[PDB]
Amino acid sequence: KIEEGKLVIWINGDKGYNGLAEVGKKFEKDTGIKVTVEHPDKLEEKFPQVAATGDGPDIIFWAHDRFGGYAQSGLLAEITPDKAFQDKLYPFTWDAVRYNGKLIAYPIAVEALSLIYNKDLLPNPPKTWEEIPALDKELKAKGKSALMFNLQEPYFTWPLIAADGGYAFKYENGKYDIKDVGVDNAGAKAGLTFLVDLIKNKHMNADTDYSIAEAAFNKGETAMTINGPWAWSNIDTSKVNYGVTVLPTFKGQPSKPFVGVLSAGINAASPNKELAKEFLENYLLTDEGLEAVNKDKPLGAVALKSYEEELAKDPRIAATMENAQKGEIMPNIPQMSAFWYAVRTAVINAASGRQTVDAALAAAQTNAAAEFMSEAIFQPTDIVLAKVKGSAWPAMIIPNELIPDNILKTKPVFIIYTPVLKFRKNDTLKSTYCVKFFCDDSYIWVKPMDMKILTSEDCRKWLSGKQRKNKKLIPAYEMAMRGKNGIDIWEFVEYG
Ligand SMILES: OC[C@H]1O[C@H](O[C@H]2[C@H](O)[C@@H](O)[C@@H](O)O[C@@H]2CO)[C@H](O)[C@@H](O)[C@@H]1O
Questions:
Q1: InterPro entries, per this entry?
Q2: Which domains are delineated in the chain?
Q3: d(CA 76, CA 266)
């Protein structure tokens, strides 16, 4: 599906993807390059499993917190803007997408959750979470409720959990300590206990989700919701008379939203990196590109200084920014998805009554500390199943140092092997690889989507079943069942 000459773009379903697709059409009009914007379910979960397959996007949009994990797994291409372009965006938005000294994406916009409230039902929103049980009593008498927001995603409940001292990873001396997790300390427990009590006393329901909360507020059934800038569009349509303001305090301390930077990363496996850079820098990251997206669904405070000086007059933006300053910029470290999943499970189990607050958070604490497992990155000397198309044939990835010069010339448009002989590793996925087939000795250039890692257990399973009835592939599989240790790759290149 991904192929040279075209762009496939993924962005989340709550973002202004029709607006983004209008920028895509402008790009297609001027350049002839087709742009397809998609918004699949669970895209932040899917990207790592399909980035190296034919089903990956060239460009992925998400909050920066997922991008450290992607980069550690080699899925993101390094971004290389000159000083002039960097000067166009705020420094702190670049740092959000800096990973191990490298720029790993283009920042787009800054997102924080705010308290949104119906100015008709409630001209004086509570400054404190504590006021809300009594406020809901009063509103229940009038056929309404005080507050509804998405309880299925920890993003929305984290500000309350963090208010009295909950945190993700301890930050000191400019680095995150991954073994110091603040998920089950007395503060986090206090905040999640408050949430569960709101449920128990019937002021909120445990299965309220994004669209339930959205419909409810937009129809005037609830005085308040908690949401981001992307949601202001549908409230405008509603003609609910609404304000956007600072989240309530908990035990006198501000709610502390995790702040996100919507960012666009480029798939390291993509053959369209230069096109992707042209689209992002020259079409999206301009006043008119960003405006088209923002008029579909508000971006928040954009990273682009020129367009932001316009947007910054909006009091809804100022409120976002105030909440952002009371919260934390999310870490981009690879441990973040394990943290999010751990806390997601904890909140859903506690709110539903399926587990206590103490036991839910204690399990989340240990889970959030699990060692991060990066996706493997195709390396030279790796043993693969390679498709000439052409049927899949066992082969070895050849390092550039060993590639016969004639074969180099046909290339598409350190691992220490020996004290003197070292192979530069692949830092990321590549758009093309030079492999050499076993018991065949021919070379080919392949895309990653046409390679699959081949283990020895893979070989046996093949050499044990009905697949062995295909005789021509037996010596191939049985050379590769040896593993890369059992093959002198210098010999294999030199003499077959
Ligand atoms: O709830 C966990 C989730 O939080 C954040 O996801 C946000 C995203 O940043 C926003 O742009 C918006 O779309 O809502 C999402 C939550 O529904 C993290 O970015 C994400 O990694 C995390 O899993």
A1: Maltose/Cyclodextrin-bd, SBP, SBP_1_CS
A2: 7-111+260-329 (3.40.190.10), 114-256+335-368 (3.40.190.10), 383-495 (2.30.30.140)
A3: 6
